[PDB]
Each structure stands twice: as C-alpha cells, then as structure tokens.
Amino acid sequence: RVLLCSAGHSSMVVPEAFHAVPEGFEEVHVFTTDSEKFNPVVLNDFFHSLPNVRFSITKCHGLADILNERDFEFYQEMLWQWYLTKMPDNELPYVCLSGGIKSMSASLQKAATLFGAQSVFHVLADNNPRNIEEMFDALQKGQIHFIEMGYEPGWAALRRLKKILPINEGCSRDNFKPLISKSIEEILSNVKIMASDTGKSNQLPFPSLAILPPIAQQWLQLPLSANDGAWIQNLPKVDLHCHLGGFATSGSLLDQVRGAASEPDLIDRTFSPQEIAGWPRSHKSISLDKYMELGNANGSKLLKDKGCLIRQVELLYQSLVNDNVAYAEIRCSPNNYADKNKNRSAWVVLQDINDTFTRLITEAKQKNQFYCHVNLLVIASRKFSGDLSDISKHLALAITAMQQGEGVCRIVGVDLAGFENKETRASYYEHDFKAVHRCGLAVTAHAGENDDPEGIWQAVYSLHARRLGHALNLLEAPDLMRTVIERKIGVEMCPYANYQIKGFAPMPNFSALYPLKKYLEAGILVSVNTDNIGISGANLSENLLILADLCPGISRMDVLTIIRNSIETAFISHDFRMELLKFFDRKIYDVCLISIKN
Amino acid sequence: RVLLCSAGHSSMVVPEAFHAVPEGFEEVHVFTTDSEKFNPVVLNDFFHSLPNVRFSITKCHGLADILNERDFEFYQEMLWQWYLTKMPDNELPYVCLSGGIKSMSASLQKAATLFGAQSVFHVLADNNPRNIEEMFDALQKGQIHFIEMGYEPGWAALRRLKKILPINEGCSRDNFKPLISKSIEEILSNVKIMASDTGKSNQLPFPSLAILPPIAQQWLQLPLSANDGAWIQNLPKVDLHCHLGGFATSGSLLDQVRGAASEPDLIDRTFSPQEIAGWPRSHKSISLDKYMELGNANGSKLLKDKGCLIRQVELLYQSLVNDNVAYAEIRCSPNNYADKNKNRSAWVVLQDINDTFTRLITEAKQKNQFYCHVNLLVIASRKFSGDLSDISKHLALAITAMQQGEGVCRIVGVDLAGFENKETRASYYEHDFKAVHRCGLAVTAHAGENDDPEGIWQAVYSLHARRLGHALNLLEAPDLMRTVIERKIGVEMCPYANYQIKGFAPMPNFSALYPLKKYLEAGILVSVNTDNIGISGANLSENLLILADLCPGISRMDVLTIIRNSIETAFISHDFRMELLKFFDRKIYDVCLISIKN
Numbered sequence A, B: 001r002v003l004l005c006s007a008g009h010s011s012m013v014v015p016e017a018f019h020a021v022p023e024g025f026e027e028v029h030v031f032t033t034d035s036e037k038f039n040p041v042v043l044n045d046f047f048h049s050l051p052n053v054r055f056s057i058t059k060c061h062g063l064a065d066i067l068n069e070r071d072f073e074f075y076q077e078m079l080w081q082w083y084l085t086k087m088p089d090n091e092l093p094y095v096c097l098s099g100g101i102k103s104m105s106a107s108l109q110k111a112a113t114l115f116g117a118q119s120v121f122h123v124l125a126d127n128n129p130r131n132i133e134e135m136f137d138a139l140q141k142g143q144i145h146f147i148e149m150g151y152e153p154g155w156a157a158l159r160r161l162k163k164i165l166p167i168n169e170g171c172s173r174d175n176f177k178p179l180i181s182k183s184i185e186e187i188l189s190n191v192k193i194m195a196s197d198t199g200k201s202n203q204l205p206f207p208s209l210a211i212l213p214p215i216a217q218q219w220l221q222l223p224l225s226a227n228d229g230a231w232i233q234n235l236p237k238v239d240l241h242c243h244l245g246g247f248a249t250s251g252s253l254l255d256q257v258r259g260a261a262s263e264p265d266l267i268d269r270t271f272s273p274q275e276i277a278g279w280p281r282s283h284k285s286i287s288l289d290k291y292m293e294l295g296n297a298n299g300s301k302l303l304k305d306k307g308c309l310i311r312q313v314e315l316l317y318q319s320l321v322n323d324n325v326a327y328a329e330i331r332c333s334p335n336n337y338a339d340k341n342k343n344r345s346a347w348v349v350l351q352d353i354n355d356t357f358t359r360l361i362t363e364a365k366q367k368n369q370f371y372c373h374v375n376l377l378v379i380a381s382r383k384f385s386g387d388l389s390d391i392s393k394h395l396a397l398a399i400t401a402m403q404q405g406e407g408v409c410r411i412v413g414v415d416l417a418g419f420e421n422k423e424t425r426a427s428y429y430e431h432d433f434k435a436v437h438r439c440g441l442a443v444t445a446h447a448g449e450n451d452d453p454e455g456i457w458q459a460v461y462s463l464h465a466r467r468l469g470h471a472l473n474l475l476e477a478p479d480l481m482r483t484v485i486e487r488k489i490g491v492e493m494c495p496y497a498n499y500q501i502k503g504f505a506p507m508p509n510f511s512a513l514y515p516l517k518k519y520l521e522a523g524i525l526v527s528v529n530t531d532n533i534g535i536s537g538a539n540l541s542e543n544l545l546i547l548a549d550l551c552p553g554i555s556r557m558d559v560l561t562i563i564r565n566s567i568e569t570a571f572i573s574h575d576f577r578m579e580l581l582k583f584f585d586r587k588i589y590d591v592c593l594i595s596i597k598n
C-alpha cells in the first residue's frame, strides 16, 4: 500500500491522506514541482514521528510553476516517469488528489486512470487546518472528510511501460524525450486504427496481446534478417527436442565435465574423436556415422559414473538458462548409463537426474531469477539385435518413473527414436504401447528422414504418436500432410541437424529447398529444436539465425508463431500450460517493446 | 458540436473556453452548483452578443457546494444525469476543465473518460482577467493557454443508458437513483477487481479485446446474468450438433413444411405430439423414449417429398441466420429420407441438400449480407434390429460425397448417433471403420450417454474420434480427464437437451450440478450446441443464456472461450479456420463495443 500525493500549495494534505485510512499505510510518497515555497520540515518531522512508514519527496527540477504548453508537457512527462517508478510490483497504489491547483490535479487524475490506481480519493476539511495539533484535533472531532471517487482497473498493458525506463538518470530539457507520450500516441493510434479501418481490424490473430505500436507491428511483419540475433537471444524460447548425451563433445566443455568425477582417472580424458573441418557451417554434406562418433567422447563412454553425470546436468542447465530458454525437455537414455557392477541401475540413474534437475530448478526459482522449467523424456532406443526385451523394460521404467508422485520436474513421456528402417518401422512394436497410454503418458516418434509415408501414417494412427521427428519429406504425400494438419500433430524440426545431414541454403551442388516455409503456410505445427547442441555446435538462437537464409522469406511473426507452436505441442498439464502462456506473453511483450527503441 | 463546461466561484472561464476552437462554436451548456458567488449575468450577456450560439444554464438545485461525501455523490448524480442528457446524437462533445475546484474537476473528467468526449482540454490565463475588457487583450497577446491532453474517445457506445434508463432532471439523490446503472457498473467492476482470475481470463481469446476500453475489459469478467440475453443475440456463434430432421417438430413451421409437399393426401396431419407443462424448461426429467416420441410428428415419414425437403432446408438456413450464427454443421441421414419407389436414392437426396445449401450460400453472399457457412455430416446410426450392412453403405456414401470437391457446403465427417443398448463401443463397429480415416474424413461419436464410460477410451483411440458427444458423467474418470485434456479432443454438449433428458439444478430433488464450469477450468474443449432446435423449442441463444442458472458464476469470458473452442474443434480447412477467426474477431470486437445493455 503506497500513497501518492501531488504537492501543490498545501502541506497538511499529506498527513490528512496518511491518517485518512483507519488502518494506515506502510508507504507514503509525494511529488512536487520546484516551488521554493514548500517547507519539508513539517512533513519530515511528521514522518519521523512514525518511522515504521517510508516517506519520499520528489521535486520536479527546473520548473517551479507552469507557464506554457512546453512547461505543462514537461511537468506531465516528469510526473508520468515518477508515477511509473512508484508502481508496486504486484498491487496498485492509493492516490490522493487534494493537493495542487486544478491543472496538476487533472493531470494526476488522468495518469491514475491511465496506469491504474488502487483507490483515488480527495481530502477536504472545513476548518482548513494549519497547526499539527489541530490536525489531531480535527481527527478527534471529525471535521476532515475523505471522499473516494471510485477504483479504475487501469490499462493493464500500459503499466508494463515501466521497463522502457524507470528514470533516465536525471533527464534534462536538452535531451528530454517524451517517451510515455509516445506510449500515449501508440494507444491512440491503435484505437483509431481499430475504429477506422474495418479491414485492418479484421486481421488480428497472432499470439495473444497484439496491441503493440503499429511501428512495432509492421516491424514484426517485415521479413526477418540475419542481424536480429540479439532480439531472439533476449527472446525466450522453448526446446522440445534436446539430447542429454550430446552436450559436451567439443571445446572446453569436456574438460570441465571430466574435472568432476566420483572416479578420478579411470576415464580416458585425452583421446578425442577427430574434428570435421568447418563447423557448424560445414559446406559439405555428411550423413550419420561421423555424427555420433564425433560425440563418442561423451555418452555411454563418459557419464557411467555419478559425479560426472551431475556436472553434465548442471552445465546443461546453465547453458539452457544462459540462452533465456523458458522451458525445455531433455531426451536421456537410462539403460545406456546404468552400471550393475557399481550398483547403479537405470532407475537409480533416472532418480539422480530427476533429483539434480528439481534441486537446480528450486534453487533458481527461490532467487526470483529467470528459471527454466524442465521435463524429462525416456528414449526407447531401437538398438536392433541386442536384447529386444530391453525395449519393454524402458516402457516399464517410464510407467514406474512418473508415478514417483512428488517433484516439479517429472518424466512426461516416452520416445520411439533409434535405428529407423523399413523393418524397424513403428508398426513393428505396436502391441506393447497399449499400456503406456493407459497410464496417462505421452508418445512421440522419429520417422520421415528415411522411412516411407506408410510408416509415418502407422505411427500416427497406431501408436497415437502426439508428435513426430524431422520428417522433411511430407510434401510428396499431400494426404499425409492433410491428416497431420487436421489432427494437430506437432512436428519437431532440427534446422542445423538437417542442414548438416542434407543440403539447402545455397549448398554447393544441392538444389533441394527446406520445407519449413511451406510447412508453416500449410498450417503444420512446427517446433524448432536443437537435437544435439554440442554435436551441432548451435543452440536455439543460432538455429533461428540460420532459419533466415535457410528458408528465405520468413518474417519475425513466423518466429513468434513457431514459439507458440512449441509451447502448444509440448506435453504439459493445462494449468501449467496456462501459467506458461501468461509468462511467455508478458516476456515477449516486454522484449519487443524494449527492442523497438534501438 | 456541444461544449459542456463547469464553473464554481470563477465566472470568466466559459468565454475563454469558447475561443478554444478557432473556427467558432455553435452550442454551449454549463452546469454549476447553487453557489451564489458565480455570476450568470456576464455569461448571459456574452452569449447574447452571439445569437447563433445556443446558451443553456443548469444549476445543481439544493446544493450550494460540497462539504462531505453525501454532497459529493449528490453532485456526481446531477452532473452525470445532466451529461447523459446533453450528449449530441452522433458527435462526441467538447469539455473544458478551466473552472471549478478539484471536486467537479475530477467528477467531469471521470465522466469524460467514461462517456467519451471529442476534445477534453484546459484553458488557463496568465493575467487571470476577471472582465471582458481584460481578456480581449489577454487572448490577443497569447497569455491565455489552451492546454490539451489529446483525444479521449472513452467508451464509444455508452449512451443507450439514456434510453433504457429514463431521464429525470428534477429529483434528488435522497429522492432516489443517483447513478444506479452507473452505481451498478462501478460496484460490479470494483467487486470483480477484488476477485479477478487471469487463470480464467489469461485465456483471453480473440486478441482484439486486448484493445477494449479498461471499463469494458473487466465488464465481461463479471458473472453472466439473464438480462444480458439481448447481448448474446448479437455475438456470432457456432452450432455443431444440429440434426436436420429435428428443426421442424411443432408450431407454424411444421404447417409450412407440410404445405410445401407436392401431394397432400399422403401427409399425416393427424398426429399431434402431446405437450409438457413448462416447455422448454421442463419440470421433470423425460426419458429418451418419450423424447423421440415427442418428435414423431416429423422426420423421414414426412420429409420423403422433394419439395418438403427443400422447404425444410431453406427454413433451417433462414432460422439459423436469424440466430446470428456464422458457422454450423448439420447432421443428416440420407438413407432415412430416400424412397426407391420414385427413383429417390439416398445419394440423390444428399446431392439435393448439398446443392440447396450451396445455392442459399451463393444467394446470401451475393447480397453481401450476414451469410452463414454450413457443412454436413452423414449419420451412421447403430442400424437397429440388426442388418449392419447398411452401415458400410452410409460410410461409402460419405466418401463419395467427400470427393465431389467443388462447391461451398461440403461433407467433412461422419457421425455415430443412436441407442447405446447394442453396447456399440468401437470394436463392435471397428470391423470396417479403419478405411474412413485414410480418405481424410472426420469422425465424431455420441457414446457414453448412459452406460459405463469405458468404451469412450476405445472411441478416442480405436476410432480416433476427434470429438465426443454429451458424456456428462466424464467427471468420475480422472484417468479419462487427463487423456481427453492432453489429446485436445473436443466435446460437444447441449445444455437444454441434457437438462431435459437427465434433469439438473436448480430443479428440486435434482442435486446434480452442471459440470461446464469444472470442464472449462480443467481446460477441456467444450462446445455448447442445440441438438434439435424444433424438439427443444429453443435456439442457440436461449441455450447460452440458460447457463447463468445452470452454472452460477459463469463470466462472459467463459462464453467467449466456449465460442473459441467451438471454432477450434470444428472440422474445417486450416485457411478457412484463419478466415473464420479473422471475421469472428472483428465481429466480436464490434459487438462488445456496442454491447452495454443490449
């Protein structure tokens, strides 16, 4: 509860507004011009008499009184800036309007009904009290009257103007910028456009809260450029497809990963796979083989031990948060890491992963920073010949993992990734999953890179795979594209991974074109991902950069729709999805409103 | 244009406010308190010097000034009533803040923010002239300053309160109603702000309402009331479960369809369904047997004639347009309305209905009226008394209807409607249902109405149904809640039809509460429909307004979210979905702008 009062030619109004409410206030603040008439001694001593409250006095430097239009507009801009500095973070402040002449009174009333105000009230006393003792006398006999003129919600989105700038470190006339007046022209232009052009007012879908300035709107509509890296780096993102076993494979990451191991040297730390010339912008297409062997230094060869796994998890989480990713899912193979002779089963590995992830998430949240929620995916790897029954084990593991009850990070679904082939098509294992759906799990599938459209159709219609993987050649089966679109089955795409595997973006002697633009035009729910960040040497931001020249003709609104698809085709509960919706909307609004300025 | 100005002690404010418009001003009206300090003689003479300017003086009878709360809201009542009396018919008024103490200043500036003013402004004089001789030179030397804070459109449509609420110039507040309607909106807005739930609002659909005035945004967050029925006769709606045969069951409509028959000897005018007291708000639950015995007057036995069918479909289209519905899906049974005696095959009947709907669409669109797009769904009933072979027939017909292609009205899916006594849970009809999905047709389901919610699982999975019918008892299956919510499977339900067949609150002896609020909170995609309009005797608007009694506390955001879900779950092309959303957003924005009290 913060009291805001405009100080004009009367001083007792501040105490009147303070002890107006019978319960009182824990915060009182006043704003005034450069009028030398006002003496702060009385208000200062009155505040000192109740130190439990906080008193701040704001003086409009450079102007003691209003003389012209320029003076009034400068005073109004200073008042607006001071007001936006005094917004309580969660609730709204109380405001008293009994101080000043009609001019600043009307200005503060308009500012209050603009940015909101918890309660707007006037104070008036018949006796016109002068001496403090008869403030208290008037309270005892009740000649001071408090009138409330309603409670307006205010403009919800305008409040956020704050970020644009709390204070410009003592703004001066030579460099004064009426930016909140630019917010006013923004809202005025938005309303006028809505009420003027019926055709333009027709075309407002997009991700919600599209009341941005028209300059910002057509900037977003402008095709995205390769120089927008900082924008998307500041823009929160979502990663629905990331592999745990391919984070630290090149650079200095492996040294830090090996630097902490429950074991001390039973780990080949020197030998590394040979590096491929040029990365991640290799101009020569390579297909598999060289991909995983580049990451052979990581994976089953490295995270068999405990502390190295914890170090890898911590570094992956730090990399995720450092890229402003708000939410992501990690694909990890428990049986690929379990060690029986060390009494480390797959269940123990998954429990350790869950514990470290939830501990890190809770620690990040408790500090009120930007914390990245993470859910886990277990991969039923198709290792072909070796011990078919192990696949069943993985399913059981999934069914027994999410049932652990408590935790903020939870096993959310299973995966069908592995050695894709005609024989290894999704119709082969169709008899096993009839139970995994019965327990409320979610199922994805990896097909389309090499499998036929029949395999994709079977995966969609037999396993009820709520998502897909890669699937770069749906254009040859329009019926398959149709049935994917109408069922709202999201498709996870890894731009850099396919760019390495295949050839597009004026690749040398490669005339194939990426289907992302056509995919988004047709309405498929593409979610841009990273697959193996360490192997591909690129995070989400670099994928979105390369999306510019990989699919020429993509605007920033396409990126926003891709983000919405990513946060829409992720297995999460409805309430959590709603909170994520709200937070993402707020963050995108803030980031675009701050990026337009420069 | 009309100028409204208020003055207190000062009297020289009005003529200075007159020179605000350089071109001149045509009518000016002034409201002031009963204070005798204000001198009307000088203003009267100044306005008689300009005979072309209409002058009217209004005084706050019985209130010299304000010295307490009661006087303040008394003056608020007088000022708001005089204001609403002084709106011009189409043009927003001009208002100035030059005269009066903070009380009236705040009052009329809040009024301008609420009712909307073309130009709110301020006039201040450096040399504060008191007579005409001084302010001539004061304006000629530029000392008088015309402060302005820009356009204040406010709520564009907040004037029907003049008509709905009668104007009473001569009265008191001690007498009665001061703002009443204004009191209602202020208290309800405040109460909503104390109790606001983005959780049930963050879900703000149709992003254009993010530009609605702040006084309007929370207005829809209030719980719905029956008096808002007129309003829900204005929003474009969607009706998906609307059987064709049940449109005409009684009234003059049955006479009209009977009279269009080519031969009147074979028309069974004899039968007359019995009436039930309190229809449509039945006082007792009615079983399914009596339910379709009530509709036995019409149906196939009366629609066999071609002209009868044509008249029926034309009247259904006309009534559907009368309900302001924009998109609809009609469930029809072709084989039911086919007689082989006159070479009237079922495919011919379907072609006739499709061509009639296409012709109506083209005729409505040519006149640029509010046409209603309609699609069709064949009905694959349970095929009572055995003889399931016809099932295949229907499905085959649907496929051949889908591939016709050209036109506006199309066949987008099939239906599974009928008795549950056969225990038709997917596998009973799964022997041949696999091929439908390959063709790309949609498939709904009407199951679980009275039996154990177990075959619903198979209907969701084995049938791959994209929508469900009724399933009111879905609450007691959390394992089914989680799947149906995560699968985004929509559910259609008709409040009037379910209330009639099963009985619900606030009926005595019926303790069952309608699960719509819980369903919406859980995040389900729920679509309110009408089933059979003629059977229920209530269009979609009545079905929507009955929710206030059926589910207390339902907000207008809930109705808008219901409409959004109905748009989402409809079986349509993706581009058609964007176009429908594009039209719906603008229509809903206009309806909400001109919504208040109608």
Ligand SMILES: Nc1ncnc2c1ncn2[C@@H]1O[C@H](COP(=O)(O)OP(=O)(O)OP(=O)(O)O)[C@@H](O)[C@H]1O
Binding pocket: A089, A163, A326, A368, A369, A370, A371, A372, A373, A579, A580, A583, A587
């Ligand atoms: N689901 C979420 N995911 C990530 N962060 C969240 C989530 N929910 C809340 N937060 C955090 O709540 C905090 C609220 O911050 P606040 O409302 O004060 O806005 P801000 O400080 O101006 O900018 P910022 O959002 O960067 O903190 C955010 O920092 C955000 O990181």
Ligand SMILES: [Mg+2]
Binding pocket: A243, A417, A531, A532
């Ligand atoms: Mg992968």
Ligand SMILES: [Mg+2]
Binding pocket: B241, B243, B417, B446, B531
């Ligand atoms: Mg039905």
